[PDB]
Structures are given as C-alpha cells and as structure tokens.
Design a protein around this ligand. Structure first.
Ligand SMILES: CCCCCCC/C=C/CCCCCC(=O)OC[C@@H](O)CO
Ligand SMILES: CCCCCCC/C=C\CCCCCC(=O)OC[C@@H](O)CO
Ligand SMILES: CCCCCCC/C=C\CCCCCC(=O)OC[C@H](O)CO
Ligand SMILES: CCCCCCC/C=C\CCCCCC(=O)OC[C@H](O)CO
Ligand SMILES: CCCCCCC/C=C\CCCCCC(=O)OC[C@H](O)CO
Ligand SMILES: CCCCCCC/C=C\CCCCCC(=O)OC[C@H](O)CO
Ligand SMILES: CCCCCCC/C=C\CCCCCC(=O)OC[C@H](O)CO
Ligand SMILES: CCCCCCC/C=C\CCCCCC(=O)OC[C@H](O)CO
Ligand SMILES: CCCCCCC/C=C\CCCCCC(=O)OC[C@H](O)CO
Ligand SMILES: CCCCCCC/C=C\CCCCCC(=O)OC[C@H](O)CO
Ligand SMILES: CCCCCCC/C=C\CCCCCC(=O)OC[C@H](O)CO
Ligand SMILES: CCCCCCC/C=C\CCCCCC(=O)OC[C@H](O)CO
Ligand SMILES: CCCCCCC/C=C\CCCCCC(=O)OC[C@H](O)CO
Ligand SMILES: CCCCCCC/C=C\CCCCCC(=O)OC[C@H](O)CO
Ligand SMILES: CCCCCCC/C=C\CCCCCC(=O)OC[C@H](O)CO
Ligand SMILES: CCCCCCC/C=C\CCCCCC(=O)OC[C@H](O)CO
Ligand SMILES: N[C@@H](CCC(=O)O)C(=O)O
Ligand SMILES: N[C@@H](CC(=O)O)C(=O)O
Length: 439
C-alpha cells in the first residue's frame, strides 16, 4: 500500500501543497480584479498599470522569500515548523483580505503571504525528499506526483474562488482562500504527525555557536542598508508606490547580478549558466505574465460574459497536467539541456507572438475568442515542460522574471497590446535562437 507507488507520507505533503497552491492561485486569480474594483470605487489610488506592477512584484517577493525559507528551516526552526507556521501566516494573509476592509489591508495581506510562502513552499518540497532514503529510486516519481498536486490545486482554485467571487463578492472569495490553506494545515498537522520523521521538527543543520553573530551582522547590515535607501528615497521625494516597486525590482535583480560578479574550468561553467539563467528569467517573466497581462487581456478583450474571467488562470495548470504524462513517455522514448532552455523560451515567445495576432487582425477595441488565450497558455506551458523539469539562482530566476515583469507589464494596454506581445514575443524567440548558436 502506497500513494501511487510512493510512501503514504507523500499524500500528506501532496495535500498540504495542493491546498496552499489552492489558496495562493485562488488569491492570484482575483487579486488583480480586486485592485481594479478598489480603484474603480475610489478606494485604491493607483493606476491599473501600477496594479499590474503590484501583482508582478508580489510574485517576485514571494519567490525571493522562498529562496531563504529553506535556510531558515534547515538552520533555525526546522522544516516541519516552517511549513506549519508558514501555512498559518498564509492563511492570515487571506483572512486579512476576507475582513471588511479595502485597500488598507492589501499591504498586510501581501507581507503575511510573502513571509508565509517563503516558509512553506521551499520546505514542503524538502519534506518530500525526506520520505526517501538516499538510494531510493522512487524519488523522481514521487516529486513528479507532488508536482501534479501543485497544479491540481492551482487548477481548481480559480474555478472555485472565481465562482465564489462572482456569487458572493471578493471578501467571501478571499475567505475561501483562507479556508483552502486551513484545510492544508489540518491535513499537514495531523497527517504529518503520522508520516513525517520527527527529526524535521528541528533544524537538521542548526547554526553552530560561532555562526550566530556573523549571520546576525549580515542580516542587520542588509536591513539597515535597505532602510537607509528608503530614508534617502523619501528625503529626495522618490516615495511613490512605483518608486518602491522599482526599489524592490532593483533589489531582486541585483541579487543574481552580485553572484554573477562574485564568480578557469569552474569559471566557464558558471559563465555558461548565465545564458541559461537569463533564459529561465525571461521564460518565467512571460509565464508569470499569465496572471497579470493575460489576466488583463481575458477581462478586457475576450468574449467571456458567461463565465468568471478569473477561470482563465486555470488554463496554465490544466496544460501542465495535460503535458506532464506525455513528456514522461517522451524523455524515456535527445536534446541537450541548454537546447531545451532555448526551445522552452522559444515556445514562451510563440505564446506571446500568437497573442499579437487577434489585435493585429481584429483591432484591440473589440473582443476576440477565448481560444487565443487557450492557445497562448498551451504554448507557454509547452515551453514549461522543456525548461522546468530540467541552485539558488535557479529558484531565483522566477523572482527576477517577476521583478522584470513589475517593470514590463506597466507597458501593457489596448494601445500597446500588439506591439507589446510582438516585441517581447519576438525577443524571446530570438534569444532562444541566440541560445541555439551557443548550445
Ligand atoms: C499543443 C500546443 C499547440 C497549440 C497552439 C495553437 C493555438 C492557436 C489558436 C488560434 C485559434 C484562436 C482563434 C480561433 C477562433 O475561434 O476565432 C474565432 C473568432 O471569434 C476570433 O475572434
Ligand atoms: C485569527 C486567525 C486564527 C488562526 C488559527 C488557525 C489554527 C492554525 C492551524 C490549524 C491546524 C490544526 C492545528 C491542530 C493543533 O495545533 O492541535 C492542538 C494541540 O494538540 C497542539 O499542541
Ligand atoms: C524576501 C522579502 C521580500 C521583500 C518584502 C517586501 C515586499 C513588500 C511588498 C511587496 C510589494 C507590494 C506593493 C503594493 C502594496 O503594498 O499595496 C499597498 C497599497 O497599494 C497602498 O497604496
Ligand atoms: C521580518 C521577516 C521575519 C521572517 C524571517 C525571514 C528570514 C530573515 C532572515 C533570515 C536570514 C537569511 C540569510 C541566509 C540566506 O538567505 O542564505 C540563503 C542561501 O542561499 C541558502 O543556501
Ligand atoms: C496566530 C493564530 C494561529 C495560532 C496557531 C495555532 C497554534 C497551535 C498549535 C501549535 C502547533 C505547532 C506545531 C507546528 C509543527 O511543527 O507542525 C509539524 C506537525 O507535527 C506535522 O508536521
Ligand atoms: C517574525 C515574522 C512574523 C511576523 C509577520 C509580520 C506581519 C506584518 C504585518 C501583518 C499586519 C497585517 C494587518 C494589517 C491590516 O489588518 O489592515 C490594516 C487595517 O485592517 C486597516 O483597516
Ligand atoms: C481560524 C482560522 C481559519 C479561518 C478560515 C477562514 C474563515 C473565516 C471567515 C469566513 C467568512 C469571512 C467573512 C466573509 C465576508 O464578510 O464577506 C461578506 C462581505 O462583507 C460582503 O457582504
Ligand atoms: C520583530 C523582528 C523579528 C525578526 C526576527 C528575524 C530573525 C533573523 C534571523 C535569526 C538568526 C538568529 C537565530 C538564533 C538561533 O535560534 O540559532 C541558534 C543556534 O542554532 C544554536 O543552536
Ligand atoms: C528583521 C531583522 C531585524 C534585525 C534583528 C535580528 C535579531 C533577531 C534575532 C537575534 C537574536 C540573537 C541570536 C542569539 C539567540 O537568541 O540564540 C539563543 C541560543 O540559540 C540559545 O542557546
Ligand atoms: C545606503 C546609502 C543610501 C544612499 C545614500 C545617498 C545619499 C545622497 C544624498 C542624500 C541627501 C539627503 C537629503 C536630501 C534632501 O533632503 O532633499 C534633497 C532634494 O529634495 C533633492 O536633491
Ligand atoms: C519582509 C521584511 C523586510 C522588510 C521589507 C518590507 C517592505 C518595505 C518596503 C516596501 C513598501 C511598499 C510600499 C507600501 C506603500 O503603501 O507605500 C506607498 C506610499 O503610500 C506612497 O504614496
Ligand atoms: C549604495 C546604493 C545606493 C542606491 C541604491 C540604488 C537604489 C536607489 C533607488 C531605488 C529606485 C528609486 C527610483 C525612484 C522612482 O522610481 O521614481 C520616483 C517616483 O516615480 C516619483 O515619485
Ligand atoms: C506554433 C504556433 C505559433 C503561433 C505564433 C505565430 C506568430 C507569428 C507572427 C505574429 C506577428 C503578429 C504581429 C502583427 C503586427 O505587428 O501588426 C501590427 C499592426 O499594425 C497592429 O498594430
Ligand atoms: C499537436 C500539434 C498540432 C499543431 C498545433 C500547432 C499550431 C500551429 C500554428 C497555429 C497558427 C496560429 C494562428 C491562428 C490563426 O491565425 O487563426 C486565426 C483565426 O482562426 C481567425 O479566424
Ligand atoms: C476545460 C478548461 C477548464 C476551464 C478553464 C476556463 C477557460 C475559459 C474558456 C475556455 C473555453 C472558451 C469557450 C470555447 C469557445 O469556443 O469560445 C466561445 C466564445 O464565446 C466565442 O467568442
Ligand atoms: C496533449 C495536449 C492536448 C492538446 C491541447 C492543445 C489545444 C490548444 C489550443 C486549442 C485551440 C485551437 C483552436 C481551435 C479552433 O481552431 O476552432 C476555431 C473555431 O472553429 C472558430 O472558427
Ligand atoms: N507554477 C509553479 C512554479 C512557479 C514559479 O516558480 O514561478 C508553482 O506555482 O509551484
Ligand atoms: N504553472 C503554474 C500554475 C499557474 O500559474 O496557475 C505553476 O504551477
């Protein structure tokens, strides 16, 4: 008796992550429309472009947070408490949006979910590893299943939450996201006590006595530096919301740039990763624009009067679930991995070049078939299979992509739509071609 051949403990972690991803993408699917709503009613004083930018940098900080969450668990609080308290924070994040408040609750929600997801996401992935001995052949399949649960949650969430929002309003809808996380916590807490190794209740690599001060000094100088930059920003008058978004943008992008510089055999192999890293960043940029630019296109440019427009956010994980089996049968039934990055990026590029067509053909003032978006996601997710299944800089790439997005999505609107999709679509394809030369 197993969970699809794997230890039953995988079900617990499967469920845990499925329900967190549910809460997250349920929130993601309507948060942009929520901010629109708050703007339309005069509660939130930003442009829609800024709103879009907020979505992107939000994602960016979530993934950035995920890059330290593993450290915090491994060295300070343990993987299992990280996941639990991570989940608690996420739930609080959604509860904050379920409360009868408006724009004033957004920052609080975002911070709670940023911190919480940073604690939970990397560490739930870690606990999946813990189900297996070093020599266990099932490890790849186990993770493959675990990834299925991520998208299962990501898939039904826009459906359920979007429907709820339409039916009962945003606050109720966001409360459902809170409930989603609560369900995950329940299964995680009680299921975890039955399946998970007690060793992970504590850090497996606790800070040695002499490691504490140096860590403390490093964090302190960073926070002080960040605070100092903000002080200077405010004295010089660079204190608009977009200004803060730019600071966050710069921080998120400077982080890999500093590792670039930081680091002849091993050299030319670190240098060799840079085009790959750029490729991943650009891919995730495009992929992460699904919930922002494509979310916007869905709401403004699509014949969608008969269903909640947030449901388009289900197309992304739907296609992942559809493609993953095929690519199992395919990688065994061969392109080099850098080549896989190029083509993955090429397909992302094509997913945007496609989107240029309805506007170029039909104009951008009318509405087009939903199939355009369906095809768009079909292409980018095809790209995801090529790059995703194939260390810090890697999970950092998605944060950098979203940071880049915080800048780029503010350029998207009906007037720029065709050029936007065309140029960044063509750019990605070309850089895919560039990678081919370098492959
Ligand atoms: C396996 C991945 C390959 C799939 C990618 C190809 C997807 C291309 C889709 C283009 C079709 C969208 C337009 C068709 C349509 O319904 O037009 C009718 C009209 O109402 C459009 O405004
Ligand atoms: C204002 C919002 C309050 C949020 C409270 C949500 C509760 C947090 C997690 C629920 C997961 C189940 C936890 C079960 C549990 O801790 O058992 C209680 C006790 O046996 C443990 O010492
Ligand atoms: C690993 C930590 C990542 C850094 C955490 C800082 C990120 C904090 C907020 C993310 C950006 C959110 C800006 C949008 C926002 O807060 O909305 C506030 C309302 O619009 C107020 O006008
Ligand atoms: C006010 C936020 C409180 C929540 C804790 C967030 C974590 C804040 C400080 C933890 C110190 C993290 C420094 C270590 C680190 O990030 O290194 C990452 C390495 O790349 C992992 O190998
Ligand atoms: C801020 C309101 C929320 C308060 C949280 C409820 C606190 C109640 C009990 C604390 C539970 C601590 C257990 C955390 C943990 O390590 O989970 C691991 C489980 O044993 C399964 O992995
Ligand atoms: C050691 C890290 C754990 C601490 C997590 C930091 C939490 C930071 C901010 C959470 C506060 C969110 C509440 C804000 C809020 O409720 O909206 C404001 C009022 O309701 C306005 O009507
Ligand atoms: C103990 C933590 C688990 C809590 C999970 C979330 C459940 C909490 C509240 C559910 C209902 C939230 C209020 C819904 C709401 O007020 O929407 C109505 C709007 O105000 C419009 O009438
Ligand atoms: C209200 C701000 C609270 C923010 C707290 C941020 C803490 C950031 C990093 C924690 C580093 C210090 C950890 C101390 C610790 O427990 O390690 C002890 C050693 O492992 C001893 O075995
Ligand atoms: C956002 C972080 C703001 C900067 C301040 C971070 C300080 C947070 C925690 C540092 C506490 C000092 C670490 C030493 C410590 O408490 O460990 C206790 C020992 O592990 C007990 O044996
Ligand atoms: C981590 C270092 C942060 C960056 C330090 C750069 C310092 C450069 C100028 C600081 C000037 C602070 C007062 C300026 C001020 O009050 O207003 C200036 C005028 O509004 C425009 O120049
Ligand atoms: C995770 C703890 C590390 C500390 C980072 C916390 C976030 C710090 C700065 C981001 C603030 C984002 C802007 C929030 C805001 O509403 O300011 C907008 C002003 O109203 C400008 O008019
Ligand atoms: C030792 C490095 C010190 C400087 C670090 C670089 C980061 C400095 C500022 C972050 C970006 C601020 C740009 C402000 C901005 O975007 O425009 C201002 C607003 O749009 C107008 O209110
Ligand atoms: C395997 C499926 C691949 C589907 C993607 C193929 C897309 C190829 C070319 C699309 C280029 C559309 C740009 C049209 C354009 O820019 O016209 C400008 C008009 O004046 C509208 O501003
Ligand atoms: C199993 C793969 C089957 C092949 C799918 C690859 C799709 C290749 C090219 C699709 C061309 C994209 C342009 C769509 C298009 O131009 O149609 C316009 C609308 O039909 C207007 O009526
Ligand atoms: C089965 C996918 C799960 C649900 C995801 C929601 C995706 C939203 C729409 C996808 C299907 C669109 C309807 C198909 C179609 O032919 O378009 C009808 C339009 O009214 C034509 O203008
Ligand atoms: C193994 C993956 C399964 C394949 C899924 C790929 C499907 C991706 C996009 C489907 C949209 C293709 C357009 C359909 C179409 O041409 O219909 C147009 C109508 O006849 C309107 O004239
Ligand atoms: N779509 C995947 C990965 C997203 C990313 O890393 O940017 C998830 O939500 O788990
Ligand atoms: N493809 C994303 C899911 C989504 O964007 O909805 C991950 O998982």
């Amino acid at each position: 008796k197993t969970f699809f051949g794997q230890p039953l403990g995988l079900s617990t972690l499967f469920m845990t992550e499925m329900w967190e991803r549910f809460s997250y993408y349920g929130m993601r699917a309507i948060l942009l429309y929520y901010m629109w709503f708050l703007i339309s009613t005069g509660d939130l004083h930003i442009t829609r472009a800024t709103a879009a930018s907020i979505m992107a940098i939000y994602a960016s900080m979530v993934y950035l947070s995920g890059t330290i969450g593993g450290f915090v668990a491994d060295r300070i609080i343990g993987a299992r408490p990280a996941v639990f308290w991570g989940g608690v924070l996420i739930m609080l994040g959604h509860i904050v949006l379920a409360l009868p408040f408006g724009a004033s609750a957004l920052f609080g929600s975002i911070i709670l979910i940023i911190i919480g997801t940073g604690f939970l996401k990397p560490n739930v992935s870690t606990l999946v590893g813990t189900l297996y001995d070093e020599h266990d052949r099932r490890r790849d399949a186990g993770f493959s299943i675990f990834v299925f649960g991520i998208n299962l949650g990501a898939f039904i969430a826009p459906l359920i939450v979007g429907a709820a929002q339409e039916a009962a309003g945003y606050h109720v809808a966001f409360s459902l996201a809170a409930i989603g996380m609560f369900i995950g916590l329940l299964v995680y807490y009680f299921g975890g006590k039955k399946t998970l190794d007690p060793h992970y209740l504590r850090p497996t690599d606790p800070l040695a006595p002499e490691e504490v001060k140096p860590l403390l000094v490093k964090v302190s100088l960073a926070v002080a530096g960040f605070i100092a930059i903000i002080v200077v920003m405010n004295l010089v008058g660079w204190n608009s919301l977009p200004a803060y978004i730019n600071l966050l943008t710069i921080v998120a992008i400077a982080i890999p740039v500093f590792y670039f510089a930081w680091m002849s055999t091993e050299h030319l192999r670190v240098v060799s990763y840079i085009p790959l890293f750029i490729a991943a960043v650009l891919f995730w940029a495009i992929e992460e624009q699904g919930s922002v630019v494509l979310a916007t296109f869905a709401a403004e440019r699509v014949d969608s009067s008969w269903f909640p427009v947030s449901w388009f956010q289900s197309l992304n994980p739907l296609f992942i679930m559809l493609y993953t089996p095929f690519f199992a049968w395919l990688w065994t039934a061969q392109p080099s991995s850098p080549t896989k990055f190029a083509v993955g990026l090429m397909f992302a590029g094509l997913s945007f070049l496609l989107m240029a067509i309805p506007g170029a053909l039909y104009g951008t003032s009318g509405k087009v078939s939903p199939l355009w978006l369906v095809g768009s996601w079909a292409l980018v997710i095809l790209g995801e299979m090529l790059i995703s299944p194939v260390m810090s800089m890697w999970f950092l790439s998605s944060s950098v992509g979203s940071a880049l997005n915080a800048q780029l999505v503010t350029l998207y609107n009906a007037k720029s739509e065709v050029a936007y999709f065309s140029y960044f679509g063509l750019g990605s394809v070309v850089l895919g071609i560039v990678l081919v030369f370098l492959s």
